[PDB]
């Protein structure tokens, strides 16, 4: 897993950003679910960008593939 | 956003054997996008339900309200 130390940084940033006038309290279960989701989603999207990498017969993932991925799934 | 090596560890989980140096920054952008959407949706639902606290179920609502999560 990733550490909570920098993750809750960003969770707080975005709770504050879209809160609608009261900072929105965010239970422990919510935090754990967000962390789990982001970890497996990043694993997933890295694997798919690396599928693009493999598709062009090179083994080194680079921003070429990351950017094609960004185009595919916004 | 993400540490430095945690990006590497997630890459190595994903079957990525070699990584470019720019990737981390790009990866961070990706994370910022994803979470930023999720939290948004979750907060909004918590805001519609007239509750003060984001919950695991609100996270589930936000994830489900994505569609492109799978591929």
């Amino acid at each position: 897993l990733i550490p909570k130390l920098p993750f809750s940084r960003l969770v707080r940033e975005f709770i504050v950003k879209y809160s609608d006038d009261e900072p929105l309290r965010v239970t422990e279960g919510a935090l754990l679910a967000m962390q789990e989701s982001c970890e497996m989603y990043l694993t997933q999207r890295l694997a798919d960008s690396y599928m693009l990498t493999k598709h062009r017969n090179r083994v080194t993932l680079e921003v070429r593939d990351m950017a094609l991925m960004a185009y595919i799934c916004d | 956003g993400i540490t430095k090596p945690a990006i590497r560890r997630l890459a190595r989980r994903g079957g990525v054997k070699r990584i470019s140096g720019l990737i981390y920054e790009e990866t961070r952008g990706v994370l910022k996008v994803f979470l930023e959407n999720v939290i948004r949706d979750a907060v909004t639902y918590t805001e519609h339900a007239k509750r003060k606290t984001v919950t695991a179920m609100d996270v589930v609502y936000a994830l489900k309200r994505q569609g492109r999560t799978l591929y």
């Binding site: 909570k4 130390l5 809750s8 940084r9 969770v11 707080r12 709770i15 504050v16 900072p23 929105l24 309290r25 965010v26 239970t27 422990e28 279960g29 919510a30 679910a33 789990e36 989701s37 497996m40 997933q44 | 003060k52 606290t53 919950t55 695991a56 179920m57 996270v59 589930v60 994830l63 489900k64 999560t69 799978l70 591929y71």
Partner: peptide, 30 residues
């Protein structure tokens, strides 16, 4: 095969939560 794994993970997230926080007032303790 991805969809099944995500649906499992979401079924998991359906579990206990407790510990309401006031994000900034809490996150000092993270």
């Amino acid at each position: 095969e991805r969809s099944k794994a995500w649906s499992s993970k979401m079924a998991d997230f359906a579990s206990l939560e407790d510990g309401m926080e006031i994000d900034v007032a809490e996150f000092d303790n993270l």
